[PDB]
Amino acid sequence: XXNXXYX
Amino acid sequence: XXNXXYX
Numbered sequence: 070x071x072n073x074x075y076x
Numbered sequence: 077x078x079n080x081x082y083x
């Protein structure tokens with residue numbers, strides 16, 4: 070992954 | 077805050 074969030 | 081990221 071490598072992105073973050075939270076969704 | 078309360079959301080996430082990272083920007």
Ligand SMILES: C[C@@H]1O[C@@H](O[C@@H]2[C@@H](O)[C@H](O)[C@@H](CO)O[C@H]2O)C[C@](C)(N)[C@@H]1O
Nearest residue numbers: 070071072073074075076080081082083
């Ligand atoms: C911001 C980030 O926090 C840690 O990564 C988190 C990871 O431990 C956790 O399992 C997932 C899912 O809740 O959320 C990530 O944000 C470590 C990092 C990547 N070094 C960074 O500080």
Ligand SMILES: C[C@@H]1O[C@@H](O[C@@H]2[C@@H](O)[C@H](O)[C@@H](CO)O[C@H]2O)C[C@](C)(N)[C@@H]1O
Nearest residue numbers: 073074075076077078079080081082083
């Ligand atoms: C506020 C934030 O806390 C840390 O990052 C969090 C990470 O440890 C955690 O696993 C995820 C999901 O619960 O949320 C992240 O925000 C480190 C940061 C990004 N430096 C920051 O202090």
